[PDB]
Amino acid sequence: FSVEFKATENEIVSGKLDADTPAFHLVMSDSGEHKGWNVRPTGASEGGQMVSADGTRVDLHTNELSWDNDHWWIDDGSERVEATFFLAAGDEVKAGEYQFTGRVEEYVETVINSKDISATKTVKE
Amino acid sequence: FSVEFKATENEIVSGKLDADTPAFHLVMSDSGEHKGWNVRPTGASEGGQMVSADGTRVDLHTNELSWDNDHWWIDDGSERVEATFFLAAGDEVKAGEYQFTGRVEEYVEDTVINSKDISATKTVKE
């Protein structure tokens, strides 16, 4: 069971976004049998947001995972799932170094593996 | 001593597999006297997997060979051994062109007397 979570490489500059814009990339993997995965935001990211030092909160979205109130999930039995988290078109994005913290879970049927993820994405000038 | 190793002809689509589904075919030949063979996965395939570009792994299986921790093997002294490697019924298969790499070894009782790398790629899907 392996999890990789990191900022995307594309630069984001302060302002109001024309389009959906990548901010994080996630990969969840396990050769062992499973039903799927959860990505649960933790601490300040609760709500599914990325957060700067000055407390500015920005929503994350992904087209590779589903959402259920406060977390992402997906039923996927394959060995490996990839996901991009993007910021939505229109969103104003302001000052700083924005951190996402969460916890990945692997489940069956019941959680059988889990690991914290954290990464920080930069915005601006 | 010859080895033939290649992707099967049957088309695979991504999704949950409804049956044991062929992926590769292996032929190991020697009319010379020998005890058996090993088929040892190499590189990314170690563990017994075919591995796609993005690193996704699918387990390979065969009913024609035995297994010893990390490799297949068979005592078979005949001139020719065939084997087919299949994906297990129910496995959800996804994204890519999946390669298997390994090494074949022919052994005798007394001990390896011939060896050769094998490599092939199987396409999945859509």
From Swiss-Prot, chain B:
GO terms for cellular component: pilus. Keywords: Fimbrium, Signal, Virulence. The keyword Signal applies. Its main location: other. Disulfide bonds: none annotated. Transmembrane segments: none annotated. It is found in: Fimbrium. Forms a homomer composed of subunits assembled in a large structure resistant to proteases and chaotropic agents. Major pilus subunit. Expressed only in pathogenic serotypes, it is part of myf, a probable virulence factor. This is Fimbrial protein MyfA. The lineage of its organism: Bacteria, Pseudomonadati, Pseudomonadota, Gammaproteobacteria, Enterobacterales. The gene is myfA. The chain holds residues 32 to 159 of 159 of the full protein.
